[PDB]
PDB file of N, CA, C and O in Angstrom:
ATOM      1  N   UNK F   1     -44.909 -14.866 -25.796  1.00 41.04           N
ATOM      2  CA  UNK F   1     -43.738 -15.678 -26.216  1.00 41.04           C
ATOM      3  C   UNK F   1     -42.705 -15.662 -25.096  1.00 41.04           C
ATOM      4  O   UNK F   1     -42.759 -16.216 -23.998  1.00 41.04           O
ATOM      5  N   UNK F   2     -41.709 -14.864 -25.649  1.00 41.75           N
ATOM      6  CA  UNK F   2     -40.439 -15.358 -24.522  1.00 41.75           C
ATOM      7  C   UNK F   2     -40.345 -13.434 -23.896  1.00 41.75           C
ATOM      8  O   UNK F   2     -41.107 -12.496 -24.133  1.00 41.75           O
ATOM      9  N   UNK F   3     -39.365 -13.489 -23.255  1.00 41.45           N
ATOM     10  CA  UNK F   3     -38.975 -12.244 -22.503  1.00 41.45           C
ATOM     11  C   UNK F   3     -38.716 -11.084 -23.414  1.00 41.45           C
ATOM     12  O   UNK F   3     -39.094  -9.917 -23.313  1.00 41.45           O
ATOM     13  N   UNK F   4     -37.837 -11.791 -24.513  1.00 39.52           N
ATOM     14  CA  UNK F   4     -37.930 -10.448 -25.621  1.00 39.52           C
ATOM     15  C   UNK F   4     -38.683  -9.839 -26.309  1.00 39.52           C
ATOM     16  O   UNK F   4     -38.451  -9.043 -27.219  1.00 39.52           O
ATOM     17  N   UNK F   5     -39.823 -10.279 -25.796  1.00 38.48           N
ATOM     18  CA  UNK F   5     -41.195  -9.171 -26.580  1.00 38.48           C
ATOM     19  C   UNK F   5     -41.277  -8.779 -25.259  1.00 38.48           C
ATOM     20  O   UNK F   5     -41.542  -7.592 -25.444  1.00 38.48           O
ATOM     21  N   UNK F   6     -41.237  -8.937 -23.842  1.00 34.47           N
ATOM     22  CA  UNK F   6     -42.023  -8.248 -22.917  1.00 34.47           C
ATOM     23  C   UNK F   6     -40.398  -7.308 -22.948  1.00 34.47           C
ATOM     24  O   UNK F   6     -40.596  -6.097 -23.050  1.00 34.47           O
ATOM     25  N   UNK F   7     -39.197  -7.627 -22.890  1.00 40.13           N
ATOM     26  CA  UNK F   7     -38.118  -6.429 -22.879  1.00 40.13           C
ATOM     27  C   UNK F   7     -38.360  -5.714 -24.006  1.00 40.13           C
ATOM     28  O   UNK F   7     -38.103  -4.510 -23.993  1.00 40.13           O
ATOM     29  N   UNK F   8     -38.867  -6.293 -25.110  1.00 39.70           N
ATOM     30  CA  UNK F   8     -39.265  -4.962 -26.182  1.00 39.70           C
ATOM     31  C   UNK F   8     -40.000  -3.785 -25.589  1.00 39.70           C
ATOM     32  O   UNK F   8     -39.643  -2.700 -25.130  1.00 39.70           O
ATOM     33  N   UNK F   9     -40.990  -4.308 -25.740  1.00 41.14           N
ATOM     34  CA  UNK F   9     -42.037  -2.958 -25.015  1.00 41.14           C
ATOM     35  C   UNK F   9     -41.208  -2.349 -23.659  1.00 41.14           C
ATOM     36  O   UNK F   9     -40.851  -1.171 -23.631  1.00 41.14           O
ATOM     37  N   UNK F  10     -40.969  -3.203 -22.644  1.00 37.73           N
ATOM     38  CA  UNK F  10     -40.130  -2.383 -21.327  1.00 37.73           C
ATOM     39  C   UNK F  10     -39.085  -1.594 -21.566  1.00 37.73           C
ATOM     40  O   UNK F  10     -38.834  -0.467 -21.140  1.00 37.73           O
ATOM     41  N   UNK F  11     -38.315  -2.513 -22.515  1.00 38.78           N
ATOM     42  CA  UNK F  11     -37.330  -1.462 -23.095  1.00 38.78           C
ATOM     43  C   UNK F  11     -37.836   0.059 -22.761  1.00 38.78           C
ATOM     44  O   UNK F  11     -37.282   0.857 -22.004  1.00 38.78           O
ATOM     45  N   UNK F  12     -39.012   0.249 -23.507  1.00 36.35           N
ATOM     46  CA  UNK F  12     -39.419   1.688 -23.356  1.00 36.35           C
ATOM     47  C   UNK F  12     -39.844   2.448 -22.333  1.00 36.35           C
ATOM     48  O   UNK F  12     -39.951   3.669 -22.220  1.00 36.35           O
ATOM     49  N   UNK F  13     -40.177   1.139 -21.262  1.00 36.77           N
ATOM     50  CA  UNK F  13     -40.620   1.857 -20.156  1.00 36.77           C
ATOM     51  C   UNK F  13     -39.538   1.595 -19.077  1.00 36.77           C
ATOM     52  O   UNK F  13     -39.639   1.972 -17.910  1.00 36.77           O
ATOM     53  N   UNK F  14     -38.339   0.807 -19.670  1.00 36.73           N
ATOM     54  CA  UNK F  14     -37.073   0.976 -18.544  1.00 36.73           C
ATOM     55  C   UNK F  14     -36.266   1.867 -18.950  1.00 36.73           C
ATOM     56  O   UNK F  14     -35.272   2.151 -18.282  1.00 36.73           O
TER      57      UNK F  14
END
């Protein structure tokens, strides 16, 4: 989808 599922998950790894 858009960036906020890939910043979801990174979230955790940023």
């Amino acid at each position: 989808i858009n960036l906020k599922a890939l910043a979801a998950l990174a979230k955790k790894i940023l």
